[PDB]
DNA sequence: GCATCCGTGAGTCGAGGGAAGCACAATTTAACACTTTTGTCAAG
DNA sequence: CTTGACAAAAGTGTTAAATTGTGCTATACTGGGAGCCGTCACGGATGC
């Protein structure tokens, strides 16, 4: 029932690698990678394509490029002579060794991942992200340098865990460069807080950050670093009130706002009635009361078949009589 | 068109993708800087639509005519932004994930179809055990593997990859076994290590290699970074390499020709495999899988001899085939989905039908449960594999908003967090799969992906709840949104917050009429604002509505003409006053608002009891019906002056109250004098002559010549009430002095106050003759006598005149109580002179009890009981002495008058003020031996006060914990009966119930007449099924029983003319989805036959549930009612005889047994020793008759006696609780609920139908099916009556919408979706959820289509 | 247990500081508390 | 809440009281016109200030939320007519 | 039979409550100028 | 009424800074940690 305990048990069934065993697996992966390049160079195929085919065969049929093209490529490799088929065998052994090398180091990622808990990602999420770095470590690891795998894999495991926190621990995602700035700002504020025996102001923090930092930038950075608050957070001891119950919806028009818009249209339509049968259409086209979008003088002219100056005269004439009708009636000033 | 049905069903992945407008590929919500949604994110505009109306995300199309156009620069459709509330997305899962609703909802739907236990399903789904889908001829422990077998991880690795083990050799020591040598189990490999399995032994890392040159046993050392490149026993020519190394300097070569021997292995690997040496090229590669007869190398010379994984060793030039099988075992929902895809429901149904004939009941019961799930999927058309999700739907972002508050902060729902984790884990799984990650990594990620789906769908159902990091609050999932008291159903669908609504403190308005309320001006201005703006525009107050609204914005800008317009606005209109809790329907009433200065609502005194409203700080809500329909309903149906009788009991509910009763009682009570009190004379003049001498008082009872009269009746004879009340005004006589008055031609001998009360009724009803027949003149007007007057006025006159009478009673009751002189002083709590004598007697008896106890004649328990009896008897005597003193010496005492009139107080409370407080109970339940001998007037001591506080806290705690129980019970009763509506005038049924008039008393062993209030509650307002001829009166069939008819029937029963009354009740009603008019009876609120279309089910539930708070003051009280309504088996259940016969007691010292003997049968009942047998030898008991005291099990009674007996038992026993508490409730309301409890049946013989034995279905359906089968000549379905509680009856209703909104929302929805249930929207809850017109009241089809037209618009139409 | 101070009058503030609550983190629940915890025990004399 | 200028909660028990009274139209207004019928509440206010009677109400938005929340649980909730033909309560705003 | 798991427990209101750095590339965005529409003033 | 002049605003095009995304780091390091009872009580349904 415990997913963490279930995972820890599963990784415990793979015995840890000795130095001799670790070197053999690392050598096989390196030999397997080189053989894949040799196979691709000779056969002309994509090195990635051959690696996937070799990987697909090693992983077996328990894993779901369609299988028919895998079989065709595999048969093509098997048709090679003994000298060329020897590189196919090395690729198969290399891929099998890579799978074993990754599985036998699943305890290393857990030891690293347990030090990143409480930073926005759950323990199992940290492990799986670290596993991705561990896989990259195996690809990049070189046994020629005689350095132990734990020395090099630690850098990649920590990198993958740290990058995942920067990319997945906030609901409103913040780039790595800005997340690094926020962490540096928090460290600086924390160090100054203990030195001054109080919470530092934005001036002290900005000075300690270095050049290019002022109180304005520190204040903006803190504003950006504010996580959104949940709409379901209860308030009060009674569990019957939430944040969402107090936030009005300001997008949809209110019944009052919708009603006055319809009232305005009715009053505007009556005002346009006093206008001539030609002036009203020009004015509504220019103000976008018909199509929803304004029309330029030439387009209004292309609509009626006159030059731009005619519309600008009609519009100024239609818009002037409305001023007269409005002033002589005062039935339209309230909506303004 | 119009929505008539709502259907819920499983959504296929094809349908989920058809819903979605795009796949959400990224967990990003919005840009942190620009605050715009990110592309492909949870708030993406190309998926869910534009944020603002008719505007793309790229700012290129910002007009309306582009409606329906998708921008080619950004992809955002140019449409309304409100589509963002409706457009969904989807998440394409890398691997299928099971829906938790169809996994953890017991019994699991997936497990039922697949015949997998809950443990087995969880192990497979969460990657704990494998399930076999294709054995491929795999043998496990010598036993071939069969399909659908669960394999653990260790077993699967064994079958899929083979056996192998590595034994680490100690340093330096050399293995005794050579490389490539087969070993057996237990064989020693090195001197210190022994193998554990038989297989080929292979050197892992030879630390030393010994080459033998020919000319020389040279030895070479191998380091951890060096690997041997040659096999053991290999001929190595001069120059050939032996050990490979990183550095060529340390590389090992051969000086000359020699043979290579490998020694000092680091460890030995023993693997069960086959080694095939080869010379030419191998046709296979490492990791391939082979079978016997497969070619391996040399072009067919070398062939495989066993199944397994083939691995080629280039160093040893041999081919190893690790013995294993290509078994197809899978975990997770991908394995489950394959099994559900392969199910043949048609074939599975046939097998289950075959197994339905198994003799074992458990085998048949299990087969039906599986087959019901199989039948549901077959009839609905759903597919079983649809229960596993391949695509996860995404809620529209406006339903899970990320909104910015006024402070610039961002607020988002928890669903965004749940969606992000699912996307984050899904994307990582795709990356891990693309990288060819090992199974352990992939399996862990798949397990998390399944858990992420389950947290989104139902958080906390399986495993620890998901909490947002930085807090311990569980995230709100989709299941939590729709379920519970805070869910969508109960918080936003069944109840809502409303516009045009206000609230304020309530004060008493005595000057108001019954139909009026005091609405503050400021409240009315805001409540009636849109109406007021129109009125202001009509007059010259404002030019238009918009300018009118600006005027009302500022308080100092409101002119004095606005208030005049507001008076015109509300003219005729009514408002709804509501006080919580709305226990019954009178909690909301319609009043005509009266604008008042202030901020408090003025409430009429007479409606306080219905509202349960006092004026110690209570508040009410005001609601404004808007349309003409809403106003008409409130002014006709909901008006306060129209609802004068209680729907629960039929008695008046708006009746005179505390101060009203006190005033009317005071004037109508006569004075009694003691001055003369017995003197006899010869002539009246002698009697008067003594009075002026002061020997006899005015109201002293004397005898003039032979008759007993008083001086007042002789001295003062008044020609009419006008003269009598004129003498009162002049102080000649008082309202309480008995005089002689000539009223209506009859020389009455009554007080002017009683004559005044007669004129009060006569003027109120404007009919002197009828009002004279309505009142009881010769008694003071207490609570009950005034209540009878209201009911009689209602029957003889109607609502209009009764409301006028009520206001007249209220006015005079208030007027007279003010000037009467009621006050409470410390001396008004008169101490009886007998209290000191009684306490001395009790002390002497108590001291006498102790002396007998000290002598050993009685034990502790009986002494404790005897002390309690002494104080209980003493407490009762003091109560008698308190009230006897009041009725002899202070007949007008304020405590006595308030108690006697019913205005305030009861004899228990008066005694504590005047007599003694009495016994008190410990918190453990025991009563203190010493009582509180001091009253509240004398004042308790410190110890007595603390002792009394134990009971006060228990009573206060009981009240707090009973409101939840009573409120829960009412909700259960509503949901089981909400669909019951009077739907037709008559259902035509000839069935009935015979309401008994005589009760089987057992202490005297005789039939005794039931109480009048009990017979009224079972006979008032009921249609006679059969003609009754009693006392020369012929009550014809179909006649509604009024109170006079009920009283006549009781009178006939007292004369031994009738024992029971056959009446039509809802129990025998045959109307579907409700009752008929003739089976219900009268509308107790209107005292007339019920109108078709009334929601009697809601009224019945409110009528039963409203007095639940008062009930609690074997089980008794509210817990007894709850178990009766839930049809629960009592803990101390009574033993009833299954068959009829004579009882034969066989009591012996060893054990107690009870025998029922018949002609051929002999039933034995083994009763416990402490069994209170109520049946003795020589008695003939019938089936279902109890043999021992206790509560009868309704289910045992139903099987032993029948459906009618259990219904009668349930109604009677529920009433016993309410009757014992003084609550009056008609039996109709309880019978409506009991009818719903007995609504279902269980099939015992399928017959010529597709129904299953033991299947539960509604009684109406099986009867309709049975009559159908007879029509085409087929064997009918044989069923058995079934009883279930209100919760079970409600949850098994046909409509899924009402059941889901009640309880078990996950369980109701998961069954309805699988069965594809279609809700026909028959009851009230379903229509309320959809906002439709409820099929009751004005929304009923009986009255909804009525047309109205005048005689001129009709005459002209008739011409055409 | 950290509650907004009730200071309607001086007695209000004095009462609040002397209140004893069975609820809070590590205590009973408002709806899970039976009659036994809510009763006046005999040992409340002079103490509660 | 008074501080938020909010309405009065018309809970389940208050709804039962209207059902018992038979006030079908009064109940329907409080469920749609006065609470969450966005098209209804906008039209009702406009009709009143123009001196007209309020129009016939429509489907509440809360039910629309219920349908969408049920769809998010992979449950196909469909509103049908007399002839079992589906009825679109979203006015074509959610149909592809 | 009993262990075991699951769902249920009044209403309205109220207020208060609100622990890495670097390099390097790749993409996005402010900044700028030139030309093109649109708008405007004149004239006949 | 249209022609042309005339210019302000708006619209393409380049393009530098500013911002964002991605890879890499080599002693050796290889199975977590908070919870923790006034455990809520009780009825129902399933199961073995
Ligand atoms: C009988 C007499 C009229 C005789 C006639 O018209 N000829 C009617 C006409 C007006 C009536 C009074 C008012 O209503 C106010 C008030 C109402 C209360 O309810 C009862 C008391 C009051 C004082 C009433 C008493 C009585 O009822 C009156 C005097
Ligand atoms: Mg009160
Ligand atoms: Mg006289
Ligand atoms: Zn666009
Ligand atoms: Zn009937």
UniProtKB/TrEMBL annotation, chain A:
<feature type="binding site">
    <location>
        <position position="79"/>
    </location>
    <ligand>
        <name>Mg(2+) 2</name>
    </ligand>
</feature>
<dbReference type="GO" id="GO:0006352">
    <property type="term" value="P:DNA-templated transcription initiation"/>
</dbReference>
<dbReference type="GO" id="GO:0046872">
    <property type="term" value="F:metal ion binding"/>
</dbReference>
<feature type="region of interest" description="Sigma-70 factor domain-2">
    <location>
        <begin position="101"/>
        <end position="171"/>
    </location>
</feature>
<feature type="DNA-binding region" description="H-T-H motif">
    <location>
        <begin position="297"/>
        <end position="316"/>
    </location>
</feature>
<dbReference type="GO" id="GO:0005737">
    <property type="term" value="C:cytoplasm"/>
</dbReference>
<feature type="binding site">
    <location>
        <position position="237"/>
    </location>
    <ligand>
        <name>Mg(2+) 9</name>
    </ligand>
</feature>
<feature type="binding site">
    <location>
        <position position="206"/>
    </location>
    <ligand>
        <name>Mg(2+) 3</name>
    </ligand>
</feature>
<feature type="binding site">
    <location>
        <position position="213"/>
    </location>
    <ligand>
        <name>Mg(2+) 7</name>
    </ligand>
</feature>
<keyword id="KW-0238">DNA-binding</keyword>
<protein>
    <recommendedName>
        <fullName>RNA polymerase sigma factor SigA</fullName>
    </recommendedName>
</protein>
<feature type="binding site">
    <location>
        <position position="210"/>
    </location>
    <ligand>
        <name>Mg(2+) 6</name>
    </ligand>
</feature>
<feature type="domain" description="RNA polymerase sigma-70">
    <location>
        <begin position="296"/>
        <end position="322"/>
    </location>
</feature>
<keyword id="KW-0963">Cytoplasm</keyword>
<feature type="binding site">
    <location>
        <position position="240"/>
    </location>
    <ligand>
        <name>Mg(2+) 10</name>
    </ligand>
</feature>
<keyword id="KW-0731">Sigma factor</keyword>
<feature type="binding site">
    <location>
        <position position="210"/>
    </location>
    <ligand>
        <name>Mg(2+) 3</name>
    </ligand>
</feature>
<comment type="function">
    <text>Sigma factors are initiation factors that promote the attachment of RNA polymerase to specific initiation sites and are then released. This sigma factor is the primary sigma factor during exponential growth.</text>
</comment>
<comment type="subunit">
    <text>Interacts transiently with the RNA polymerase catalytic core.</text>
</comment>
<feature type="binding site">
    <location>
        <position position="213"/>
    </location>
    <ligand>
        <name>Mg(2+) 4</name>
    </ligand>
</feature>
<feature type="binding site">
    <location>
        <position position="213"/>
    </location>
    <ligand>
        <name>Mg(2+) 8</name>
    </ligand>
</feature>
<keyword id="KW-0804">Transcription</keyword>
<feature type="binding site">
    <location>
        <position position="210"/>
    </location>
    <ligand>
        <name>Mg(2+) 4</name>
    </ligand>
</feature>
<feature type="binding site">
    <location>
        <position position="213"/>
    </location>
    <ligand>
        <name>Mg(2+) 5</name>
    </ligand>
</feature>
<dbReference type="GO" id="GO:0016987">
    <property type="term" value="F:sigma factor activity"/>
</dbReference>
<feature type="binding site">
    <location>
        <position position="334"/>
    </location>
    <ligand>
        <name>Mg(2+) 11</name>
    </ligand>
</feature>
<feature type="binding site">
    <location>
        <position position="210"/>
    </location>
    <ligand>
        <name>Mg(2+) 7</name>
    </ligand>
</feature>
<dbReference type="GO" id="GO:0003677">
    <property type="term" value="F:DNA binding"/>
</dbReference>
<feature type="binding site">
    <location>
        <position position="206"/>
    </location>
    <ligand>
        <name>Mg(2+) 5</name>
    </ligand>
</feature>
<keyword id="KW-0805">Transcription regulation</keyword>
<feature type="binding site">
    <location>
        <position position="206"/>
    </location>
    <ligand>
        <name>Mg(2+) 4</name>
    </ligand>
</feature>
<feature type="short sequence motif" description="Interaction with polymerase core subunit RpoC">
    <location>
        <begin position="125"/>
        <end position="128"/>
    </location>
</feature>
<keyword id="KW-0479">Metal-binding</keyword>
<feature type="binding site">
    <location>
        <position position="331"/>
    </location>
    <ligand>
        <name>Mg(2+) 11</name>
    </ligand>
</feature>
<comment type="similarity">
    <text>Belongs to the sigma-70 factor family. RpoD/SigA subfamily.</text>
</comment>
């Amino acid at each position: 029932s415990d997913p963490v305990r279930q995972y820890l048990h599963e990784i415990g069934q793979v015995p840890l690698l000795t130095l001799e065993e670790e070197v053999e697996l690392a050598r096989k992966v390196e030999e397997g990678m080189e053989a894949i390049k040799k196979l691709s160079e000779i056969t002309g195929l994509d090195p990635d394509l051959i690696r996937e085919v070799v990987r697909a065969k090693i992983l077996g049929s328990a894993r779901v490029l369609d299988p028919k093209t895998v079989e065709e490529i595999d048969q093509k490799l098997k048709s090679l002579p003994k000298e060329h088929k020897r590189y196919l065998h090395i690729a198969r052994e290399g891929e099998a060794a890579r799978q074993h090398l990754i599985e036998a180091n699943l305890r290393l990622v857990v030891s690293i991942a347990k030090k990143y808990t409480g930073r926005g990602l759950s323990f199992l999420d940290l492990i799986q992200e670290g596993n991705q770095g561990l896989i990259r470590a195996v690809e990049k690891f070189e046994y020629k340098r005689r350095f132990k795998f734990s020395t090099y894999a630690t850098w990649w495991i920590r990198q993958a865990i740290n990058r995942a926190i920067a990319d997945q621990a906030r609901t409103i995602r913040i780039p790595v460069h800005m997340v690094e700035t926020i962490n540096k700002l928090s460290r600086t504020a924390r160090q100054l807080q203990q030195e001054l025996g109080r919470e530092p102001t934005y001036e002290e923090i900005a000075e300690a950050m270095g050049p290019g930092w002022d109180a304005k930038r520190v204040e903006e950075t803190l504003k950006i670093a504010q996580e959104p608050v949940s709409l379901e957070t209860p308030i009060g001891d009674e569990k019957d009130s939430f944040y969402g119950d107090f936030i009005p919806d300001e997008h949809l028009p209110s019944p009052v706002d919708a009603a006055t818009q319809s009232l305005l249209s009715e009053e505007l339509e009556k005002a346009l009635s006093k206008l001539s049968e030609r002036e009203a259409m020009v004015l509504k086209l220019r103000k976008g009361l018909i199509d929803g979008r304004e029309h330029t003088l030439e387009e209004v002219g292309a609509f009626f078949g006159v030059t731009r100056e005619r519309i600008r005269q009609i519009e100024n004439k239609a818009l002037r009589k409305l001023k007269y009708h409005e002033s002589r009636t005062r039935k339209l000033r309230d909506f303004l | 068109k119009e929505v008539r049905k709502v259907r819920i069903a499983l959504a296929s992945p094809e349908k989920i993708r058809s819903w979605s407008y795009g796949e959400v590929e990224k967990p990003e919500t919005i840009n942190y800087r620009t605050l715009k949604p990110e592309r492909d994110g949870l708030f993406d505009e190309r998926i869910f639509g534009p944020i603002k109306d008719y505007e793309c995300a790229c700012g290129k199309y910002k007009r309306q005519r582009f409606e329906g156009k998708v921008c080619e620069r950004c992809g955002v459709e140019v449409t309304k932004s409100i589509v963002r509330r409706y457009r969904m997305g989807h998440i394409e899962l890398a691997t299928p994930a099971a829906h938790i609703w169809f996994v953890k909802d017991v019994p699991s739907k997936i497990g039922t179809l697949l015949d997998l236990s809950a443990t087995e399903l969880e192990q497979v789904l969460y990657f704990s055990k494998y399930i076999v889908l294709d054995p491929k001829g795999a043998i496990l422990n010598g036993v071939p593997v069969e399909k659908r077998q669960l394999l653990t991880d260790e077993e699967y690795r064994e079958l899929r990859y083979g056996k192998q083990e590595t034994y680490p050799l100690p340093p330096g020591v050399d293995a005794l076994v050579k490389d490539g040598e087969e070993v057996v189990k237990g064989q020693e490999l090195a001197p210190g290590v022994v193998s554990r399995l038989d297989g080929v032994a292979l050197y892992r890392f030879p630390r030393r290699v010994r080459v033998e040159y020919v000319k020389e046993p040279k030895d070479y050392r191998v380091q951890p970074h060096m690997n041997v490149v040659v096999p053991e026993g290999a001929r190595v020519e001069a120059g050939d390499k032996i050990v490979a190394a990183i550095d060529p300097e340390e590389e090992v070569i051969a000086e000359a020709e020699g043979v290579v021997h490998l020694h000092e292995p680091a460890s030995i690997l023993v693997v069960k495999a086959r080694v095939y040496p080869f010379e030419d090229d191998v046709e296979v590669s490492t990791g391939d899988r082979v079978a016997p007869g497969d070619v391996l190398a040399d072009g067919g010379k070398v062939k495989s001899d066993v199944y397994g994984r083939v691995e080629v060793d280039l160093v040893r030039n041999v081919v190893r085939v690790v013995e294993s099988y290509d078994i197809d075992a899978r975990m997770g929902a991908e394995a489950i989905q394959q099994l559900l895809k392969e199910l043949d429901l048609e074939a599975l149904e046939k097998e289950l039908l075959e197994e339905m004939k198994h003799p074992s009941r458990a085998r048949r019961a299990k087969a039906r449960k599986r087959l019901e799930v199989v039948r549901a999927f077959l009839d609905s058309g759903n597919r079983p594999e649809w229960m596993i999700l391949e695509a996860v739907p995404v809620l529209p972002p406006d339903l899970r908003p990320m909104v910015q508050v006024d402070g610039g902060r961002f607020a988002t729902s928890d669903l965004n967090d749940l969606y992000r984790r699912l996307i984050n884990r899904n994307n990582r799984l795709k990356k891990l799969l693309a990288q060819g990650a090992p199974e352990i990594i992939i399996r862990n990620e798949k397990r998390m992906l399944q858990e992420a789906v389950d947290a989104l769908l139902d958080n906390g159902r399986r495993g620890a709840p998901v909490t947002n990091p930085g807090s311990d609050r569980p995230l709100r999932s989709l299941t939590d949104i729709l379920s519970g008291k805070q869910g969508r159903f109960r918080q936003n669908l069944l109840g809502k917050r409303v516009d045009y609504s206000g609230r304020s403190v309530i004060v008493v308005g005595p000057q108001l009429k019954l139909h009026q309320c005091g609405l503050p001006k400021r409240m009315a201005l805001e409540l009636f604002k849109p109406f007021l703006l129109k009125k202001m525009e009509e007059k010259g107050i404002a030019p238009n509505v918009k300018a009118a609204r600006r005027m009302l914005e500022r308080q100092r800008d409101i002119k004095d003409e606005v208030w005049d317009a507001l008076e015109e606005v509300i003219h005729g209109k009514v408002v709804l006053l509501n006080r919580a809790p709305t226990l019954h329907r009178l909690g909301i009433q319609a009043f005509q608002p009266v604008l008042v200065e202030g901020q408090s609502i003025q409430l009429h005194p007479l409606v306080c009891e219905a509202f349960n409203a006092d004026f110690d700080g209570d508040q009410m809500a005001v609601h404004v019906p808007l349309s003409s329909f809403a106003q008409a309903e409130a002014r006709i149906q909901m008006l306060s002056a129209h609802n004068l009788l209680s729907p629960a009991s039929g008695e008046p509910l708006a009746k005179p109250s505390r101060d009203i009763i006190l005033g009317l009682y005071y004037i109508t009570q006569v004075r009694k004098e003691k001055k003369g009190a017995g003197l006899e004379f010869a002539t009246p003049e002698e009697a008067l002559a003594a009075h002026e001498r002061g020997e006899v008082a005015l109201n002293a009872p004397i005898k003039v010549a032979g008759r007993e009269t008083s001086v007042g009746r002789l001295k003062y004879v008044f020609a009419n009430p006008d003269e009598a009340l004129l003498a009162v005004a002049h102080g000649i006589v008082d309202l309480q002095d008995v005089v002689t008055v000539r009223y209506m031609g009859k020389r009455l001998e009554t007080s002017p106050g009683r004559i005044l009360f007669a004129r009060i009724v006569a003027e109120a009803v404007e009919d002197e003759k009828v009002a004279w027949e309505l009142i009881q003149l010769d008694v003071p007007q207490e609570k009950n006598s005034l209540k009878d007057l209201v009911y009689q006025a209602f029957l003889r006159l109607g609502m209009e005149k009764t409301a006028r009478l009520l206001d007249a009673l209220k006015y005079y009751g208030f007027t007279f109580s003010t000037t009467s002189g009621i006050t409470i002083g410390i001396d008004d709590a008169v101490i009886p002179e007998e209290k000191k004598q009684y306490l001395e007697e009790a002390d002497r008896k108590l001291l006498q009890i102790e002396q007998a106890y000290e002598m050993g004649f009685l034990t502790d328990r009986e002494r404790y009981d005897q002390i309690l009896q002494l104080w209980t008897e003493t407490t009762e005597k003091v109560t008698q002495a308190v009230f006897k003193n009041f009725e002899e010496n202070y007949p007008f005492n304020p405590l006595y008058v308030m108690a006697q009139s019913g205005a305030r107080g009861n004899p228990q409370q008066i005694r504590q003020l005047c007599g003694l407080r009495g016994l008190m109970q410990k918190p453990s339940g025991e009563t203190f031996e010493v009582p509180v001998r001091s009253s509240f007037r004398e004042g308790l001591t410190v110890l007595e006060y603390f002792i009394s506080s134990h009971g006060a806290r228990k009573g206060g705690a009981d009240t707090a914990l009973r409101t939840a129980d009573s409120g829960y019970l009412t909700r259960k009763l509503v949901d089981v009966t909400h669909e019951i509506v009077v739907r037709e005038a008559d259902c035509g049924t000839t069935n009935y119930i015979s309401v008994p008039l005589f009760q089987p008393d057992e202490v005297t062993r005789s039939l005794r007449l039931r109480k009048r209030a009990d017979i009224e509650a079972g006979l008032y307002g009921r249609v006679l099924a059969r003609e009754v001829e009693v006392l020369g009166v012929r009550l014809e069939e179909g006649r509604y029983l009024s109170m006079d008819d009920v009283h006549l029937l009781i009178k006939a029963a007292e004369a031994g003319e009738i024992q029971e009354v056959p009446v039509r009740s809802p129990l025998t009603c045959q109307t579907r989805y409700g009752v008929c008019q003739k089976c219900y009876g009268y509308d107790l609120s209107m005292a007339r036959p019920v109108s078709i279309g009334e929601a009697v089910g809601i009224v019945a539930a409110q009528s039963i549930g409203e007095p639940g708070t008062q009930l609690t003051m074997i089980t008794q009280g509210l817990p007894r009612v709850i178990e009766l309504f839930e049809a629960r088996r009592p803990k101390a259940k009574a033993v009833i005889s299954e068959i009829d016969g004579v009882v034969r007691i066989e009591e012996t010292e060893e054990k107690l047994s009870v025998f029922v003997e018949s002609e051929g049968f002999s039933k034995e009942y083994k009763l416990p020793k402490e069994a209170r047998l109520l049946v003795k030898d020589g008695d003939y008991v019938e089936a279902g008759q109890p043999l021992t005291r206790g509560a009868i099990d309704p289910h045992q009674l139903l099987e032993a006696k029948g459906p009618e007996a259990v219904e009668r038992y349930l109604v009677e026993e529920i009433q016993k609780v309410y009757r014992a508490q003084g609550v009056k409730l008609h039996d109709k309301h309880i019978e409506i609920v009991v009818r719903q409890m007995m609504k279902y049946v269980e099939v015992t013989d399928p017959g010529d139908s597709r129904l299953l034995e033991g299947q539960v279905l509604e009684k109406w359906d099986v009867e309709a099916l049975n009559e159908r089968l007879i029509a085409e000549g087929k064997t009918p379905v044989a069923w058995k009556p079934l009883l279930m509680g209100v919760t079970k009856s409600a949850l098994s209703t046909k409509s899924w919408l009402s059941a889901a909104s009640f309880q078990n929302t996950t369980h109701v929805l998961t069954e309805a979706a699988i069965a594809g249930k279609k809700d026909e929207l028959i009851g009230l809850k379903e229509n309320v959820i959809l906002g439709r017109l409820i099929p009751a009241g004005t929304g009923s089809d009986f009255v909804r289509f009525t047309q109205v037209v005048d005689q001129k618009t009709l005459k002209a139409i008739e011409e055409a | 247990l950290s509650q907004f101070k009730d200071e309607t009058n001086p007695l209000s503030s004095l009462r609040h500081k002397r209140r004893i609550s069975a609820l809070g983190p590590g205590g009973l629940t408002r709806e899970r508390a039976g009659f036994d915890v809510r009763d006046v025990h005999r040992t409340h004399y002079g103490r509660i | 809440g008074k501080a938020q200028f909010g309405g009065q909660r018309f809970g389940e028990m208050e709804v039962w009281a209207l059902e018992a009274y038979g006030a079908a139209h009064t109940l329907q207004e409080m469920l749609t016109l006065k609470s969450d019928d966005i098209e209804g509440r906008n039209a009702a206010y406009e009709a009143i200030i123009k001196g007209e009677d309020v129009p016939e109400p429509s489907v509440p938005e809360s039910f629309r939320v219920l349908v969408k929340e049920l769809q998010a649980l992979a449950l196909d909730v469909q509103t049908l007519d007399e002839k079992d033909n589906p009825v679109d309560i979203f006015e074509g705003l959610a149909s592809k």
